[PDB]
Amino acid sequence: GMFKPQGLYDYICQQWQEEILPSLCDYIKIPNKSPHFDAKWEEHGYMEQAVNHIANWCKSHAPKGMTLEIVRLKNRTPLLFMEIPGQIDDTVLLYGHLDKQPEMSGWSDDLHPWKPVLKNGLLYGRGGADDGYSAYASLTAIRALEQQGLPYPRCILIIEACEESGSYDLPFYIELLKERIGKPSLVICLDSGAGNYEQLWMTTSLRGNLVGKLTVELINEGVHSGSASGIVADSFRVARQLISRIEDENTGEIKLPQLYCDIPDERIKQAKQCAEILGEQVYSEFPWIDSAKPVIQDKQQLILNRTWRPALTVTGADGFPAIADAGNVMRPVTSLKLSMRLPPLVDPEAASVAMEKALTQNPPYNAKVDFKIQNGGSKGWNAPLLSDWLAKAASEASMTYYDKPAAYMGEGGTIPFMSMLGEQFPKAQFMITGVLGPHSNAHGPNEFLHLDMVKKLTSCVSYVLYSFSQK
């Protein structure tokens, strides 16, 4: 009778076109890099511009009874908080972020990180997809239920401004806000990936991440390499030898058992199913150069590599002159930034201790070796047992708006707040989902928000909120 699922989609599409898109485009212009990428973010004022821009829009599109506050702690990024009272005596917590990754290199000639460009049904620019859409879609999902005169639960929306720097500000806000937030029964987060743009993707796990700096030195100044080569070990050779203690150079297999966990059987089964759904799109849509290929061909194992196994990337370095600048001097120091994704269930403290010991003990040639972990190292997340009402709601929503079943897969990235919530609220259910499908390029050049996908996804969120109301 009161609930019209296609009415939800029609309203949500109109809202996306007429109300959201202009505002979101204006948000893309704001160069509000997260604090790790701009230590002077406060002085520069862009973060403040962004939170006021999104807050302004929320206030003019407010559900009934909404309290909105830009919450502020000293020297911290601001936090956008909304409380929508609803009529049902239960709470849902919706989360996203509004801070951005930096420009990056490789933008197409017609595209720019701080210039919104709408082409081929895609909205290009930094932060449209990751994660500017989140506040808009979350609030619109509630507004769509009000359009139909339907009741809904109490909703708390948290749109933070430190996520791209590890959410280090967030625990302080949650301590301030704890009693006001209360106990959510459902957590919705619109900052995750999608296997394709054809169905609803439910994230069943997130990896942890630990970042540190490995420094290796044998000598305290640069030395003529003719004199030294053959007697003084080069610090680069010692550094790569140390990395071989933790990672096999041929396969990439991490050698430290403390960086693995047992993978739940249901996640192995889900990976099999997702391999069948995606086929070669498990890997084919990475920006491979020439005939480059993935580390192995088995699609299920690739999914598990990405979701349930540790993996190292070397993301920066100090101590190297530019090649065109360089003479032949043997360098005094090699420093490498090591970024280690962790399986969902691995404790970052235990993994940190294991990495530091493996990399620093018994130094080759009594080299001076340090491995300094960055604070803000964060645990992954594994979904709790899925409630029947949410399995049904997700399936129904996906079939309604995509005409395809909901699909369940792990996410290879890291969203620190989900681990926090899963620990604080062990009985909460989660809907962690998003729009970051193939070529969406979060953290990369030519980032886009897929508009068809986000309209359908916003509808799914609204449908699940309605379903929550009925359980």
- Under the binding rule (CB under 5 A), the answer on residue 422 touching Cl ion is no
Question: Would you give the distance in Å from CA 398 to the centre of its chain?
Answer: 22
Q: Give the integer Cα–Cα distance in Å for 281 and 196.
A: 8
On whether 90 is known to bind a ligand per the annotation, the reply is no
Q: Which of the residues 155 through 174 are near Cl ion (CB under 5 A)?
A: none
425 binds, among Zn ion, a second copy, Cl ion, none (CB under 5 to 8 A by kind): Cl ion
On whether 163 is known to bind a ligand per the annotation, the reply is yes
Residue 381 C-beta-side C-alpha neighbours within 13 Å: 29
Q: Which stretch binds Cl ion (CB under 5 A): 59-67, 235-243, 267-275, 427-435?
A: 427-435
Q: Which of the residues 361 through 420 are near Zn ion (CB under 5 A)?
A: 411
On whether 97 is known to bind a ligand per the annotation, the reply is yes
131 binds, among Zn ion, a second copy, Cl ion, none (CB under 5 to 8 A by kind): Zn ion
262, two tokens: 């047992």
Q: Which is nearer to Cl ion, 192 or 398 (CB)?
A: 192
Q: Give the integer Cα–Cα distance in Å for 42 and 393.
A: 42
Q: Which of the residues 47 through 66 are near Cl ion (CB under 5 A)?
A: 53
The helix/strand/coil state of 125 is coil
On whether 110 is known to bind a ligand per the annotation, the reply is no
Q: Give the integer Cα–Cα distance in Å for 350 and 340.
A: 13
CB of 245 to Zn ion, least distance (A): 29
309 binds, among Cl ion, Zn ion, a second copy, none (CB under 5 to 8 A by kind): a second copy
Cβ atoms of 349 and 336 within 8 Å: the answer is no
What is the C-alpha end-to-end distance of the chain, expressed in Å? 17
Cβ atoms of 434 and 95 within 8 Å: the answer is no
Q: What's the alpha-carbon Rg for the chain, to the nearest Å?
A: 24
The CA-CA-CA angle for residues 436, 22, 144, to 5°, reads 70
- Under the binding rule (CB under 5 A), the answer on residue 74 touching Cl ion is no
- Under the binding rule (CB under 5 A), the answer on residue 113 touching Cl ion is no
Supply φ then ψ for residue 179, to 5 degrees: -75, -30
Q: Which stretch binds Zn ion (CB under 5 A): 124-132, 133-141, 375-383, 421-429?
A: 124-132
CB of 458 to Cl ion, least distance (A): 21
CB of 101 to Zn ion, least distance (A): 6
Q: Which of the residues 165 through 204 are near Zn ion (CB under 5 A)?
A: 191, 193
| The one-letter amino acid at 444 | G
DSSP 8-state class, residue 163: G
Mark residue 79 as left, alpha or beta (left: phi above 0; alpha: psi -120 to 50; beta: remaining). Answer: beta
CB of 46 to a second copy, least distance (A): 17
9, two tokens: 């989609």
Of 131, 169, 247, 447, which lies in the binding site for Zn ion, with binding defined by CB under 5 A? 131
Q: Which is nearer to a second copy, 154 or 207 (CB)?
A: 207
191 binds, among a second copy, Cl ion, Zn ion, none (CB under 5 to 8 A by kind): Zn ion
Neighbours of 92 (CB within 10 A): 27
Q: Could you tell me the strand order of the sheet in which 381-382 lies?
A: 381-382, 201-206, 407-411
Residues engaged in binding Cl ion (CB under 5 A): 26, 38-39, 53, 105, 107, 193, 224-227, 328-329, 411-414, 425, 427, 443
Task: Please state the residue numbers annotated as binding site for Zn(2+).
Answer: 53, 97, 130, 163-164, 191, 411, 443
Residues engaged in binding Zn ion (CB under 5 A): 53, 130-131, 191, 193, 227, 411
